[PDB]
Amino acid sequence: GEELIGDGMERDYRAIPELDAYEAEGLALDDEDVEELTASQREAAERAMRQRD
Amino acid sequence: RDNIQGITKPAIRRLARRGGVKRISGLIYEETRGVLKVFLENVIRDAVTYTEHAKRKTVTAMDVVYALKRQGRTLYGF
Amino acid sequence: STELLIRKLPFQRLVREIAQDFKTDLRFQSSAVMALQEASEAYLVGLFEDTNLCAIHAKRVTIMPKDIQLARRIRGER
């Protein structure tokens, strides 16, 4: 049974530059043009996903 | 690598504070973590599928929008 | 445009971990991770609102996992 408002609030809202931004690793290696889904590509996916029992 | 523990006790209080929540039980932290894991798994699995069908390995923001709309969520901005 | 709920580095590393369960050589767009983060924060803030009501109904200030589970059940998530 914990409480959420009062002393110690300020501390929860501190800025941590190190954690407040996204890492290079995991993200796309370069700014290359990415192929966006057509109606066919979207449907064949949507059909398969429903067909997942 | 157990990266669900990255949805820390501070981050769970900040979300509940924003939710209007006055006080919180202890069991909530591992409950909230589980609710997030499941939502993220179901949304990512659908997103990865759109990436595969469009014959690429890069998850775009629109693969995320299509996955969300299927899972009943609609994000403004696209 | 700034919002401090879930921290950005631990969020990314969780999305990266969950995508690994489904597919290898997956890269995300900065835009893609940002989409999933706005989506998760919006889902959890909104669910924290609904779980808050369930507590008030049982006439309690302190939110319990029975409130999270009820809110989710009525939404048709179980």
Numbering used by the authors:
A (entry chain C): 69 to 121
B (entry chain B): 23 to 100
C (entry chain A): 57 to 134
Q: How do the authors describe this structure?
A:
MCM2 is positioned at the core of the replisome as a subunit of the replicative helicase MCM2–7 that unwinds DNA and separates the two strands of the double helix prior to the action of DNA polymerases. To gain further insights into the mechanisms involved in histone management during replication, we have solved the structure of the ternary complex between the histone-binding domain of MCM2 and the histones H3-H4. Free in solution, the MCM2 domain is mainly unfolded but, upon binding to histones, it wraps around the surface occupied by DNA in the nucleosome. The interaction with MCM2 induces a conformational change of helix αN of histone H3 and competes with the binding of H2B.
The complex reconstituted by mixing MCM2 (69–138) with full-length histones H3-H4 was crystallized and diffraction data were recorded at 2.9 Å resolution. One molecule of each protein H3, H4 and MCM2 is present in the asymmetric unit. After refinement, electron density is observed for residues S57 to R134 of histone H3, R23 to F100 of histone H4 and G69 to D121 of MCM2. The crystallographic symmetry reconstitutes a tetramer of histones H3-H4 which closely resembles that of the nucleosome structure (Cα RMSD of 1.12 Å) showing that the binding of MCM2 is compatible with the formation of the H3-H4 tetramer. The MCM2 fragment (69–121) wraps around the H3-H4 dimer complex and follows the position of DNA in the nucleosome so that it clearly competes with the binding of DNA. MCM2 residues G69-L97 and V102-R120 have extensive contacts with both histones H3 and H4 and adopt mainly an extended conformation interrupted by two helical segments: one helical turn involving residues M79-Y81 and a well-defined helix from residues A107 to R118. A network of polar and charged contacts are formed with the side-chains of three arginine residues of histone H4 (R35, R36 and R39) that establish close contacts with the DNA in the nucleosome. In particular, the Y81 side-chain docks exactly into the same position as Y53 in the αN helix of histone H3. Y90 docks into an apolar cavity at the interface between α1 and α2 helix of histone H3 while MCM2 chain wraps around the DNA binding region including histone H3 R63. The first part of this segment adopts an extended conformation and competes with DNA binding and the second part corresponds to a helix that docks on histone H4 in a more apolar groove.
